[PDB]
Symmetry: C3
Subunit: 149 residues, 3 copies
């Protein structure tokens, strides 16, 4: 039983030129790239991405920081929603565990490199927001017998 | 002072072609390769290796997954039995700590890349099962003065 | 918002030829190299470095192990004193978390690769002991807008 999560490299990941290193961390566990697209995020889409925070005082500055190039991604694997969050580490890099993306690359929450869905419901919503169904690619990894039980 | 542990790269580690990366993680700590042999594990030797699980429902499928090429290894170092277990991480990759082999490479317990002895008693038994005493090589690391206090 | 910490690669780090790997771990978080100097540590400077331990029975052996080439470093970043300690890991490599320098490279406390300041007061004192003010370089990282919130 696999699932799919939405992972997005934020503008700091693009500008620091660590896109490949980020992708390699997820590929290393045998997670499958199901979708990938470079875009420039707009306020219109970011308002919906961050809909839970409508009306909050930090939302304008958060949208501003995110208005830039991003890499939209979908990865598939067992428990991948929760596992991707564990791999990213805590929101605040200073609190994240060594070995996580945020602890290894970052200093502050406002520049923490990557977003990932926080739940099954959020993953479905975010994938549908950033990708049309025709952009989601279904194929089987050739090493499946050595990745899955 | 130093101990020796039995570590075995499972068929998934061979087939995913991460043998060198695994070895490098142990070399990086100054652990000494005391023995190393590629073989193909067979049901008869695997039944001995997993003797504690004789008759349990999972054992046939476990033996099937393990019937394939494996890299038998003995590493030497301070506290290396417990330390190698810590470096492998939890049996279930989803529970293993960031930075461990199983967290960094794997998804499920049935394909968790590597075996390591769980105790001094098990290390003695496993080394005797998979190696002849004379495949264990005695030599000293030239960097010993900078590895050991 | 940023502070500076004193980090010193010990003779084992020099002799095992992992200096670049150590530096890369700190650069990876966008920490700025403010000072760097190769020297050979001598007993008289080490007595001042370890002044808090005057009279303790372990001090002579400690000074002996530390007599050798060292790389003196100052890194700057948000919370970098505490964060560098977290990245080094526990004094004893066998207790340190996977993903930390000491867990990834070392076996014993007496050969644990690196020193880092333990507090704001120790950072100020150690920086002044090992570096003259003219050796501390002030410049801005070009990627600052993507490192700092
Ligand atoms: N500037 C901020 N202030 C408060 N909370 C934030 C801020 N930025 C991000 N968050 C929280 O962290 C979560 C993940 O944000 P993101 O990684 O940008 O998707 C959001 O859903 C917020 O709950
Ligand atoms: N399929 C399984 N079912 C139950 N326990 C298992 C299974 N695979 C591994 N284990 C446990 O994990 C330990 C180490 O297994 P291995 O790494 O395959 O030698 C065994 O000694 C078992 O206790
Ligand atoms: N170079 C060393 N050799 C042996 N033991 C040490 C050394 N440095 C620190 N320790 C001890 O290791 C233990 C753990 O250190 P810490 O985690 O820093 O409290 C303490 O009890 C220290 O006294
Ligand atoms: N041989 C030792 N015995 C006990 N404690 C030690 C020893 N070496 C270092 N320590 C402790 O660990 C701290 C960090 O040591 P260092 O990394 O050498 O600066 C020292 O300030 C001591 O508190």
């Amino acid at each position: 039983h696999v699932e799919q999560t939405y992972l997005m490299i934020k503008p700091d990941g693009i500008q620091r030129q660590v896109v490949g290193e980020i992708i390699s961390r997820f590929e290393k566990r045998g997670y499958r790239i199901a979708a990938m697209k470079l875009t420039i995020a707009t306020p219109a889409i970011l308002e919906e991405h961050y809909a839970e925070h409508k009306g909050k005082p930090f939302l304008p500055g958060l949208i501003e920081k995110m208005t830039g190039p991003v890499l939209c991604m979908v990865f598939e694997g067992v428990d991948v929603i929760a596992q991707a969050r564990k791999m990213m580490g805590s929101t605040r890099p200073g609190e994240a565990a060594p070995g996580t993306i945020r602890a290894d690359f970052c200093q502050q929450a406002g520049r923490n490199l990557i977003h990932g869905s926080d739940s099954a419901e959020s993953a479905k919503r975010e994938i549908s927001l950033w990708f049309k169904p025709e952009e989601i690619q279904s194929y089987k990894l050739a090493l499946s017998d050595y990745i899955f039980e």
